[PDB]
Ligand binder design. Structure first.
Ligand SMILES: [Mg+2]
Ligand SMILES: [Mg+2]
Ligand SMILES: [Mg+2]
Ligand SMILES: [Mg+2]
Ligand SMILES: [Mg+2]
Ligand SMILES: [Mg+2]
Ligand SMILES: [Mg+2]
Ligand SMILES: [Mg+2]
Ligand SMILES: [Mg+2]
Ligand SMILES: [Mg+2]
Ligand SMILES: [Mg+2]
Ligand SMILES: [Mg+2]
Ligand SMILES: [Mg+2]
Ligand SMILES: [Mg+2]
Ligand SMILES: [Zn+2]
Lengths: 94, 101, 120, 177, 148, 94, 50, 86, 99, 37
RNA sequence: CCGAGCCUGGUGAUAGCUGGUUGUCCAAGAUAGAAUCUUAGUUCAACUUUAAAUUUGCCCACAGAACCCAAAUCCCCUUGUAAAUUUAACUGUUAGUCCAAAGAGGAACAGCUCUUUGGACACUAGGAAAAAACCUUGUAGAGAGAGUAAAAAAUUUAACA
């Protein structure tokens, strides 16, 4: 008795979920901090034209640093020391 | 993590302290201290001058080999790894309280 | 169908009661937004998730700073529902070069330049 | 402390004989507290593996009282095992036939569904009336209080309380009443 | 694994921390070969650091066999009689040093699961809890519902 | 010496008599033994808390299976208190 | 209806929440909801809803 | 528990976040010598100082942009002066 | 795999066990766990649940002191709810400010 | 299914939470306007 | 054991079809479509991958994008960020399910079928009872530390001069 047609959560008939004061409190809290966000987003500090061209230097130099890091890429250096240290496997006391 | 300790008692920790064996150290943080008829607890922690908790280091050892194995179903996913976490053993030599209060 | 939601500009018009409530002066407004991610990036559109990755909020409960300017406030409006926002306000003036290390944050959005780590 | 190990251990993990009078109380509340005491949660040394339970006794389960029309409308259902052996009985007639079954099965439901449930139920004791065998009303410790207070009746309200309580309105004299 | 592995309670041998501390490592025995690239690390270690190791630790004793061996070994005996044999086959010198140092710091008892990360000699102050600590008594010590 | 308590090393017989001897040495009255608390007297697990009172003054309490065992334990407690080997005593100073 | 929607003590109304998109509910909602704020659900009509 | 109260007071929601319970040293030499800083404290100080450097940079960039706008508008004014002088 | 995924279960089980022990001790002192924890936190004592349970077991007198402190702070908070300000703050409700 | 239905189309859970938060809370004084006034 | 015998050989017949496919560890990684005696497959594209050259890539601010008869979209300097394009080499995916929304067919039926934007699953974890697709939540470990996230339905009904 008391079964559900098909899957319990989908279709023309599904299991009726109900709301709790717990979830109501949770979401009112979320949306009130979101209203705080709206308030603080309002009242900007500078205007479009005021903040137009201040960070161009930083953006440009950062991108040229990225470019330099990309361009500077080659195989590593090979050394006689690293090559010959392999001979020290046949080390032995006299 | 908290501990409840007394004198002449051992304690284990799961990391390395950079201390040689036999070294003595003064533990600063104390949430409270209790005697048979009274106890003293801070807001949150007590003053430095009030207590003096001294501990000696006894042992530095890797923990016993612990397994980490991940496995998923009918998709050929299995992944093993062994860990030996370091451990340091301390012993609280003695505890003292000052008249300053 | 479901698409990027435009916001009317009137929403971001503080009222006198809002000013009295939140303590935010419309004049001499703050310069910097402290921002934190509170909501999960999942079950959100690709644009919102890559925008929070843009701001650098892939990590939660990690306060990060931005400016209070329109070009940024646009993105903040796009992803406003996912984040906590507060202003930066400091009594002790900008952090001096000598006090770069002994700085500290506070839950009230304050940034103390000196941190003696002892009670009064 | 300054106690010997074995006496200290015995005293610590010892059992206690609690008593309760179920006259005019709800079996749900009674079963809640009894299940607590039987599991041994009230002991700060609780652990499921350690049988730290306590013996509990109930009296006057015959004088039990529900809230609402439960006596009439709530139903206990059981299947004997034979075809058509499914039958139901209201709490009223189930109480008439057996006054203890109600609280014992209430506690049976409160308790966890482990194998220790049966042992704790055996440690449990129930009595429809305030009559007890010598052993069982001798080996007691403490009578914990009741959860709810019983409201007084007009025959119980003393006269000075009635006098302190103010009358409220003037009836007209011309009225049959 | 915990159920497959045996267990023990945390303990220190002879309460080493209370009185004078003594390194519970007694003896080391190195087994190395003159030849064999596998023993190159051990040979370089006995050349450089074993001297300084002995100077740092006078209480411990060290033996070196220096015989033909396909796999170099290290054996450590403790005061308990506990033995620890490790194979240093094809192993580097700094990691051999770390191994030896943690052996010296190691206590002479098997590394297994510890049931609990502490051990108290007398945990009870203010008296251990018993059921009758936190409830009052009765006048003349009377049980509930008894006349005399 | 740290771990083990007194009567683990120094066993005794007739602790009650020894205690009465010590009390007569310390010039005090003969104390009476009285069960302070009881549980399961008829049960297979009897539980008694017996206190030793001098001149209407308690010195020690002892738990026990039976009355005699609880009395022995209370005597042991009083002896520990008198001889200063209480578990809550000052540790050894190094 | 109008005096109720003027005098309701609940500070939160479907109008505000939907026009703001304060919880990303614009995905579970329709664009029709912006004008059918709370009153309508499919063909039905909830006059008590505000 | 009590995170909302800690926020009301001004403290961190989680006491492990900041404050003396975590920022002080957890051990010192028995001789009274100062112990070396812990790695957690080191990385937290590093994060905090990077945070401060960034805040200073952002603030003074905003200030310089505002001053540049002011200067450009003043130039606008004086070049209108020049125009009507022409 | 079960040894791996039993670690978090160990954590949660032991936490809940400390919760149950502390709840029992508070109930036999006349208090309950939520009130106790909130009051201690707003009285500025950070004693985690395991030391709480260990203290409740091995040192009941100190636990009685802590429960008394918690109850007094409940009463102080009730007095403050009666009068928000315009009154002398509670002696234990007073806090320390760090800098 | 479709948006318009003969039956009341079961709504999303967030939708039902929102509709459960949004209701007409009737503004009444603390005192009933009959007994006192 | 004859819709046409049995033995050998071609014969390791072919099989877009089924089954199976052996040591350990790390990383990146499900993606619009077109043609096909083609829809159980395949070629190209798209996506993904590796190594390299270069520089712009993403979010986007005003302005701008039809007469006929709505949410949004294209482009887009700034800004915040670090990816993108191109070159060389293949492979694999190319039989898809629910949810929200705009629609079509159907009965304003389907756990129904067909297109579009988005999300999730086919990757772990907590919750709704167990549950794929719902809600919280990602970068990996040891802990006998802590603060939180989503998270438990309320309802009782009709007198009358
Ligand atoms: Mg089904
Ligand atoms: Mg549809
Ligand atoms: Mg034939
Ligand atoms: Mg044939
Ligand atoms: Mg073949
Ligand atoms: Mg197959
Ligand atoms: Mg990956
Ligand atoms: Mg095919
Ligand atoms: Mg552009
Ligand atoms: Mg198909
Ligand atoms: Mg389908
Ligand atoms: Mg379908
Ligand atoms: Mg597939
Ligand atoms: Mg993480
Ligand atoms: Zn009235």
């Amino acid at each position: 008795r008391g079964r559900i047609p098909g899957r319990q959560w989908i279709g023309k008939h599904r299991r009726p979920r109900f709301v709790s004061l717990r979830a109501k409190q949770n979401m009112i809290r979320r949306l009130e901090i979101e209203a705080e966000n709206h308030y603080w987003l309002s009242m900007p500090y500078m205007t479009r034209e005021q903040e137009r061209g201040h960070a161009a230097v930083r953006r440009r130099e950062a991108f040229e640093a990225i470019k330099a890091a990309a361009t500077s890429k080659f195989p590593p250096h090979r050394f006689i020391a690293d090559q010959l240290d392999h001979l020290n496997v046949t080390k032995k006391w006299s | 993590r908290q501990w409840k300790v007394t004198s002449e008692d051992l304690i284990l920790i799961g990391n390395e302290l950079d201390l040689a064996c036999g070294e003595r150290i003064r533990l600063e943080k104390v949430l409270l201290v209790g005697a048979d008829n009274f106890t003293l607890l801070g807001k949150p922690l007590l003053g430095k001058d009030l207590v003096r908790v001294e501990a000696t280091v006894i042992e530095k050892t890797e923990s016993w080999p612990r397994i980490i194995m991940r496995f998923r179903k009918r998709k050929n996913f299995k992944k093993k790894r062994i860990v030996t976490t370091p451990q340091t053993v301390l012993r609280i030599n003695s505890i003292e309280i000052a008249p300053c209060l | 169908k479901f698409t990027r939601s435009r916001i009317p500009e009137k929403v971001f018009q503080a009222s006198p009661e809002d000013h009295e409530k939140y303590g935010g002066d419309p004049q001499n407004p703050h310069k910097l937004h402290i921002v934190t991610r509170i909501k999960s990036t999942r079950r959100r559109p690709y644009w919102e998730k890559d925008i929070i990755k843009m701001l650098g909020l892939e990590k939660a409960h990690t306060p990060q700073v931005h400016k209070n300017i329109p070009s940024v406030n646009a993105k903040l409006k796009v992803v406003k529902h996912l984040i906590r926002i507060k202003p930066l306000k400091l009594p002790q003036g900008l952090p001096a070069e000598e006090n770069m290390s002994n700085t500290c944050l506070k839950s009230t959005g304050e940034l103390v330049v000196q941190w003696h780590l002892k009670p009064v | 402390s300054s106690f010997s190990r074995a006496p200290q251990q015995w005293a610590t993990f010892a059992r206690i004989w609690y008593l309760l009078d179920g006259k005019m109380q709800p079996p749900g509340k009674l079963a809640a507290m009894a299940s607590i005491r039987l599991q041994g949660l009230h002991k700060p040394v609780y652990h499921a593996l350690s049988d730290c339970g306590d013996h509990v006794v109930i009296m006057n389960t015959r004088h039990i009282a529900f809230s609402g029309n439960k006596w009439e409308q709530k139903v206990y259902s059981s299947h004997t095992g034979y075809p058509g052996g499914f039958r139901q009985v209201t709490a009223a007639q189930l109480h008439l036939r057996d006054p203890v079954a109600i609280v014992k099965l209430a506690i049976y439901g409160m308790l966890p569904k482990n194998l220790h449930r049966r042992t704790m139920m055996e440690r449990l004791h129930l009595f429809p009336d305030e009559y007890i065998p010598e052993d069982i009303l001798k080996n007691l410790v403490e009578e914990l209080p009741q959860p709810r207070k019983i409201p007084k009746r007009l025959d119980e309200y003393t006269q000075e309380e009635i006098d302190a309580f103010p009358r409220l309105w003037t009836p007209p004299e011309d009225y049959r009443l | 694994t915990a159920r497959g592995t045996p267990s023990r309670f945390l303990a220190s041998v002879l309460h080493n921390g209370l009185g004078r501390y003594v390194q519970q490592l007694q003896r080391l025995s190195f087994s190395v070969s003159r030849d064999g690239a596998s023993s190159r690390g051990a040979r370089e270690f006995v050349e450089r650091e074993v001297i300084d190791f002995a100077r740092r630790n006078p209480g411990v004793v060290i033996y070196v066999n220096s015989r033909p061996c396909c796999v170099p070994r290290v054996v450590a005996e403790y005061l308990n009689g506990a033995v620890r044999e490790e194979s240093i086959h094809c192993k580097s010198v700094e990691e051999i040093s770390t191994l030896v140092q943690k052996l010296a710091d190691q206590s002479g008892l098997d590394v297994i699961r510890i049931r609990k990360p502490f051990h108290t000699d007398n945990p009870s102050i203010q008296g251990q809890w018993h059921p009758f600590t936190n409830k009052p008594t009765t006048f003349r010590g009377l049980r509930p519902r008894e006349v005399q | 010496m740290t771990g083990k308590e007194l009567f683990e090393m120094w066993k005794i017989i007739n602790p009650m008599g020894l205690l009465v001897e010590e009390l007569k040495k310390r010039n005090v009255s003969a104390p009476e033994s009285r069960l302070t608390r009881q549980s399961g007297g008829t049960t297979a697990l009897p539980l008694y808390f017996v206190g030793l009172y001098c001149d209407k003054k308690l010195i020690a309490e002892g738990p026990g299976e039976t009355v005699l065992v609880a009395e022995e334990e209370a005597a042991r407690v009083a002896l520990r208190k008198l001889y200063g080997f209480t578990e809550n005593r000052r540790p050894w100073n190094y | 209806q109008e005096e109720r929607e003027r005098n309701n003590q609940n500070p939160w109304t479907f109008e505000r929440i939907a026009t703001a998109n304060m919880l990303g509910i614009r995905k579970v909602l329709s664009p029709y909801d912006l004008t059918h704020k709370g009153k309508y659900w499919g063909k039905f009509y909830m006059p008590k809803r505000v | 528990a009590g995170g909302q109260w800690r926020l009301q007071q001004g403290l961190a929601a989680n006491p492990s976040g900041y404050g003396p319970l975590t920022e002080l040293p957890d051990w010192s030499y028995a001789d009274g010598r100062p112990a070396p800083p812990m790695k957690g404290q080191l990385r937290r100080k590093a994060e905090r100082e990077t945070f401060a450097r960034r805040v200073v940079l952002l603030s003074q960039e905003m200030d310089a942009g505002l001053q540049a706008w002011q200067l450009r508008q003043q130039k606008l004014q004086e070049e209108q002066r020049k125009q009507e002088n022409a | 795999v079960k040894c791996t995924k039993a670690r978090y279960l160990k954590k949660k089980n032991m936490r809940t066990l400390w919760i149950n022990r502390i709840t029992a001790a508070s109930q036999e002192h006349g208090l309950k766990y939520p009130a106790l924890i909130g009051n201690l936190v707003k009285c500025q004592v950070e004693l985690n649940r395991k030391v709480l349970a260990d203290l409740a077991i091995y040192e009941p007198k100190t636990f009685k002191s802590l429960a008394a402190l918690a109850s007094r702070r409940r009463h102080e908070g009730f007095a403050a709810a009666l009068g928000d300000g315009k009154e002398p703050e509670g002696i234990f409700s007073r806090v320390v400010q760090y800098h | 299914s479709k948006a318009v239905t003969r039956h009341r189309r079961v709504m999303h859970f967030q939708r039902q939470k929102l509709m459960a938060v949004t209701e007409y809370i009737p503004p009444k004084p603390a005192i009933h306007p009959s007994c006192l006034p």
